């Protein structure tokens, strides 16, 4: 008697609305990354385990790890007709690493020589382009680094090193509304409406020009922006959804029989934290570090990760995830992440001896991912232990919860997280705690930590670069910028009409591998 017009061959997946336009160097969230990575294709591609292989580059050579020479495979094309060359990379990087454009993934271009005189103050030193990126001929180009960085070739597959079409450098305000990439998929040019319907859905179709490493086996995707994971799960069970990325915590004790060999569970490189800016009342200076070492010692992580998540989380032991190489669960000074009310009530008194407390403590979250349970649990625990009044504050959308944080327009503590990009521990620490990072929401500034990490980013071998990270975490254990809570155990579930679902190292499914029919 009715129905839909889409073919029963598009693979329906869940998603969320991007808080920022679809520009590579302008997105710092997974809700937009899981579409940018479909649309574009950079110098290197990551497989499921996380090992990089040459995607567009023909060779990436060097002699002493400070001078790099990159060549490009001839014969690539954006989905517009214009070729891919060295200029499409050099100009995109130069545009991403500019102070005037104010991009969120700018700090990523820090290792490159000539970054100080391009990013920073717009006065007393003005050259518009970096002096490390040189273009030899139409195809190959050379890159210079400040100091020899160990993990440089590994990060070239990130979504901030993507090329951009020539016709993007003339109007970057329309590009973010209709991107033109060169990757496996492409935005379905809709004759019966637009491809991207804000806060509703977005669908992609394969790119007939792509000949690379991630050729799609399905015939198009459709991300559907849901309002709650309860409805997402009901749809997954009813046959209206093909892959559910994150099972809601209200269905973790029934999924084993509801899905029944259509699910999987394993470690992931994600974490969860509770942040509070350094610009709030009573939360700055020393009282404000005591008032964070107190909040960190008044939360019962083993009880929350057992009564709410049914055992599919891991209480945090440091400021990174557990599935990364070189991770250590026995750092000295770690016994500041343990539950201890007799100490949570000493630190509050040591802070009130500097300034009394008055007001409410609000913890803000986005209600479209199933955070209400653990947020309320944390709030009740803090209230019971300290005596202050703490509450939860829900907001309807991630894209609208992030736009208040990004422009410093929030006035309460908030949840936050981080989903890894490449399997390196420094990637979980630098973009969140360096001086002027794009995703440094609290406002942390510590030159000692910045230098102690920049001295680890230059170690000779790879095993001597992890001990220095573990030594650099000893300063975060003393300052406590954010409160780490737990690490993830990703559970995904698919339906009957799908046959090749597999997940990557950071919990996302392996699109371009999902075979439906």
């Amino acid at each position: 008697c009715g129905g839909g017009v889409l073919s029963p061959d598009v693979v329906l997946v869940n998603g969320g609305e991007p808080p920022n336009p679809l520009i590579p160097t302008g997105t710092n969230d997974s809700n937009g990354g899981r579409i940018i990575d479909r649309l574009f294709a950079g110098l290197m591609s990551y497989d499921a385990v996380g090992k990089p292989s040459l995607e567009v580059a023909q060779s990436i050579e060097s002699a002493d790890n400070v001078n790099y020479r990159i060549t490009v495979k001839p014969g690539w094309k954006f989905t517009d007709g214009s070729p891919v060359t060295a200029h499409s990379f050099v100009d995109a990087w130069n545009y991403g690493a500019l102070s005037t454009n104010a991009q969120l993934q700018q700090h990523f271009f820090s290792p490159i020589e000539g970054f100080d005189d391009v990013a920073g103050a717009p006065g007393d030193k003005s050259r518009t382009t970096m002096s490390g990126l040189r273009v030899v001929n139409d195809l190959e180009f050379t890159v210079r680094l400040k100091a020899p960085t160990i993990d440089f070739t590994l990060r070239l597959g990130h979504s901030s090193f993507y090329p951009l079409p020539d016709s993007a450098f003339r109007d970057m305000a329309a590009f973010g509304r209709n991107p033109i990439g060169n990757g496996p998929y492409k935005l379905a040019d809709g004759p019966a409406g637009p491809a991207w319907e804000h806060n509703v859905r977005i669908d992609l179709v394969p790119n007939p020009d792509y000949h690379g490493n991630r050729k799609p086996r399905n015939k198009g995707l459709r991300f559907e922006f849901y309002a709650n994971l309860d409805t997402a799960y009901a749809d997954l069970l009813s046959g209206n959804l093909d892959v559910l990325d994150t099972i809601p915590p209200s269905a973790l004790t029934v999924y084993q029989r509801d899905l029944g060999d259509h699910a999987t569970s394993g470690p992931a490189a994600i974490n969860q934290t509770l942040d509070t800016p350094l610009r709030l009342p009573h939360f700055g200076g020393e009282e404000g570090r005591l008032r964070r070492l107190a909040l960190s010692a008044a939360i019962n992580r083993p009880q929350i990760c057992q009564q709410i998540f049914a055992g599919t989380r891991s209480p945090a032991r440091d400021f990174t995830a557990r599935s990364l190489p070189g991770f250590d669960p026995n750092l000295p000074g770690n016994e500041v992440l343990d539950y201890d009310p007799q100490r949570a009530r000493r630190l509050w008194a040591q802070a009130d001896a500097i300034s009394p407390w008055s007001g409410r403590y609000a913890i803000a979250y986005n209600a479209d991912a199933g955070h209400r349970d653990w947020v309320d649990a944390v709030a009740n625990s803090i209230k019971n232990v300290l005596g202050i009044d703490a509450v939860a504050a829900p907001q309807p959308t991630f894209a609208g919860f992030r736009t208040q944080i990004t422009n410093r327009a929030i006035d309460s503590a908030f949840r936050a997280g981080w989903r890894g990009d490449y399997p390196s521990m420094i990637e979980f620490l630098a973009p969140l705690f360096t001086a002027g990072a794009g995703s440094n929401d609290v406002g942390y500034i510590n030159p000692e930590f910045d230098a102690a990490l920049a001295a680890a980013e230059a170690a000779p071998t790879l095993t001597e670069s992890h001990e220095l990270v573990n030594d650099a975490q000893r300063i975060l254990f003393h300052d406590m910028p954010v409160v780490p809570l737990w690490d993830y155990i990703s559970v995904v579930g698919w339906s009957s009409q799908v046959s090749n679902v597999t997940v990557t190292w950071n919990g996302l499914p392996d699109y371009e591998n999902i075979v439906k029919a």
Binding site: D29, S30, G32, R402, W418, R419, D421
Partner: peptide
């Protein structure tokens, strides 16, 4: 990036 930041988790959803």
């Amino acid at each position: 990036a930041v988790a959803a």
